[PDB]
Design a protein around this ligand. Structure first.
Ligand SMILES: *[C@@H]1O[C@H](CO)[C@@H](O[C@@H]2O[C@H](CO)[C@@H](O[C@@H]3O[C@H](CO[C@H]4O[C@H](CO)[C@@H](O)[C@H](O)[C@@H]4O)[C@@H](O)[C@H](O[C@H]4O[C@H](CO)[C@@H](O)[C@H](O)[C@@H]4O[C@H]4O[C@H](CO)[C@@H](O)[C@H](O)[C@@H]4O)[C@@H]3O)[C@H](O)[C@H]2NC(C)=O)[C@H](O)[C@H]1NC(C)=O
Ligand SMILES: *[C@@H]1O[C@H](CO)[C@@H](O[C@@H]2O[C@H](CO)[C@@H](O[C@@H]3O[C@H](CO[C@H]4O[C@H](CO)[C@@H](O)[C@H](O)[C@@H]4O)[C@@H](O)[C@H](O[C@H]4O[C@H](CO)[C@@H](O)[C@H](O)[C@@H]4O[C@H]4O[C@H](CO)[C@@H](O)[C@H](O)[C@@H]4O)[C@@H]3O)[C@H](O)[C@H]2NC(C)=O)[C@H](O)[C@H]1NC(C)=O
Lengths: 359, 359
């Protein structure tokens, strides 16, 4: 189904959640690819130690073949990751920036009740040069308590990385810009009698004199105003990621001024298109994956073709695991103690290699 | 001198610049350390190829010693980087979040001129149950054009990574929270005559009747209000990074509610304390740096002590550079073509190794 996550964005808080969840999805895709590279480099260090520890030329050549394979695919994958990584990080950064902006706006747009100050009475004065009474208030303020976004179980289910694979995303939903830019308020003035500069009894936060000044314009003459509410209403808007044909990103930059929603849509589209390719996980390699790997044809030809690969690595995956995979975790190495893979990722890694290459 | 950069923060825009400049400084420290690691791993791949290409056992052992050294120091440095990296990224993320917040607030606090709507006249009505005239305005708004921060040459000189080494930073300066939270406005009411529900001539964005209604309360009876300005004034505040003794971070979390400035100060202090250690640059290694390296004592003992190291690597740095450093950039490798270091960081890296290990 398309757009489950964006179609649940109906409020400032749900846009925030979408933006941060999608940013974290892109960041997690990069972290997962880098973790995979680091696992592969760890495997290569482990096989380098095992090569140094074997005395059989054919077993040594087999380890060399796994080192060579590993270096080739992992160096390549690390190079190929960089473009998608930068694309995805540009979008993650922008999404986090937007979510920050919107959260800050939310706090201000929650300031919906005003505190009046004590006014000063006058007669005619700017901007009412024709008035006989004025009541002037300076520094009326509105502030809210600390706001927070509260999410339901379903909000977190629907606005979730599980719904943010590229094949399902066609649009983003954003709050209209006026929520970010505009202060909105209602206000009312009230008059009784003949208010003038002498209406200087201010106990009710208005200007009164005559009679018995008091609550609800008790006095003979009164003038006042109240700001009865503030706050701009949020609206939502939809922006397509792709052009009509569905391939190309809409909202490419450089074609004229753009709105926030259009810049975000472009970045999201490009980050969705920039798919990451992860290489094989060397630490869990199977025999069939090794001998079917395209890079192993030339590597095998150089060191030893699929017939030759089985002779070196095993006729069964059981044999392959036994000889080339299980030793990473289970084989202890002691000299003057740790298992192969942990040792070759530890502070003694290089020394372990020097020691066994020397012995 | 202390606090050149924070002492130039006097405005919202200069706080933004400080926050983003310091975030980028931390991000650049991490990028520089990772670049250094990647250069070292590239050198290790290069020496692995040269080991495979030599036929002299003693030259082979020498390359093995550089591989072992490189692995040890680079794996260690990569492990040791992770804690400081995470600390520095927590601060960079928070600084960028703050700068976003403040930029969003700046846009709203620039909305300083109101647009009045056409009012509706009444008599007594809430919140003026004692009035004889009211003039009620709904949806008064204030919006600014797109704001931007403009920096002088000196702003960029003083609020600069060159002034953000830890030894010079004792405090941060931040805008007061009210700029982020509070709407401020001035407003004035004006009255003439006996305004009532019949004061329903609205051409001047006030309530008039009687006589000849017009500009400046031309009519006999008038009531109106104007919002004459909006905007909350920025203030600045200083927060110390360290406790009085100067070692420990002030504002540790977990001791009670904190303000934004205190959370930021804590994160900045921890990111400043979490110094990164970069290992030696293997691609520009000198002979004296190699034989003075502590790790080379055991590695040399294992493969070959400083006397033995000079026998393997050269009695002069000229000889060392000739035999072990210059070949990385200058030695061409061809088989069925590239220089050593570029080849071992290219898509043919592993195959180049397999080819020469087989030949
Ligand atoms: C989070 O919220 C913040 C706060 O509101 C918001 O920040 C604002 O971002 C906008 C968009 O980036 C910033 O506006 C940019 O401002 C610069 C600088 O303008 C000043 O300085 C230049 C001199 O360098 C003067 O020319 C100018 O008069 C100002 O004094 C502009 O250079 C940017 O221009 C481009 O975009 C404009 C529309 O936004 C166009 O009108 C303009 O022509 C430019 O577009 C063209 O060039 C683009 C680049 O080549 C191109 O891609 C376009 O297609 C087109 O060809 C722009 O005006 C604004 O200053 C920020 N405000 C503050 C207070 O920081 C964040 O955007 C928001 N973030 C998210 C992700 O939601
Ligand atoms: C950019 O601008 C944004 C927008 O203003 C701003 O976001 C706001 O950040 C604050 C600070 O993080 C957020 O406040 C936090 O809100 C949570 C959630 O509160 C709700 O939900 C909980 C249930 O989980 C309810 O209990 C609660 O009643 C609310 O309904 C709170 O859990 C956080 O509490 C800690 O900090 C408070 C003070 O801020 C304390 O009063 C509270 O006791 C907690 O502190 C204690 O626990 C801490 C953690 O263990 C500990 O370190 C302390 O020392 C202490 O022991 C907090 O209230 C707020 O919701 C965000 N607003 C929105 C709209 O997103 C960003 O902070 C700002 N960023 C930057 C970097 O400038």
């Amino acid at each position: 189904a398309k757009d489950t996550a964006a179609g649940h964005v109906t409020t400032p808080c749900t846009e925030i959640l979408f933006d941060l969840t999608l940013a974290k999805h892109y960041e997690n895709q990069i972290q997962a690819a880098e973790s995979a590279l680091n696992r592969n480099y760890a495997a290569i260090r482990s096989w380098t130690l095992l090569e140094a520890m074997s005395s059989d030329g054919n077993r040594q050549n087999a380890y060399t073949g796994l080192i060579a394979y590993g270096i080739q695919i992992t160096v390549n994958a690390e190079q190929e990751l960089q473009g998608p990584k930068q694309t995805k990080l540009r979008a993650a950064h922008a999404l986090r920036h937007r979510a920050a902006n919107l959260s800050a706006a939310l706090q201000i747009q929650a300031a919906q009740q005003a505190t009046l100050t004590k006014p000063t009475a006058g007669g005619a004065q700017t901007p009412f040069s024709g008035a006989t009474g004025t009541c002037k208030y300076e520094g009326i303020t509105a502030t809210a308590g600390e706001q927070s976004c509260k999410y339901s179980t379903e909000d977190e289910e629907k606005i979730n990385a599980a719904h943010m694979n590229p094949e399902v995303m066609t649009q983003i939903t954003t709050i209209g810009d006026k929520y970010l830019t505009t202060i909105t308020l209602d206000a009312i003035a009230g008059s009784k009698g003949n208010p003038t500069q002498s209406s200087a009894t201010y106990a009710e936060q208005d200007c009164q004199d005559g009679g018995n000044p008091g609550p609800n314009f008790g006095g003979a003459n009164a003038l006042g105003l109240q700001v009865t509410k503030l706050g701009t209403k949020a609206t939502t808007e939809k922006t397509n990621l792709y052009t009509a044909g569905g391939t190309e990103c809409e909202h490419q930059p450089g074609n004229g001024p753009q709105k926030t929603k259009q810049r975000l849509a472009y970045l999201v589209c490009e980050a969705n298109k920039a798919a990451i390719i992860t290489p094989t996980d060397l630490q869990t390699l199977t025999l069939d994956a090794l001998i079917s790997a395209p890079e192993m044809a030339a590597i095998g030809d150089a060191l030893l073709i699929q017939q030759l690969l089985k002779k070196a690595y095993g006729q069964t995956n059981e044999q392959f695991q036994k000889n080339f995979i299980k030793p990473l975790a289970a084989q202890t190495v002691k000299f003057k103690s740790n298992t192969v893979a942990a040792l070759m990722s530890s502070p003694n890694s290089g020394l372990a290699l020097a020691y066994h290459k020397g012995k």
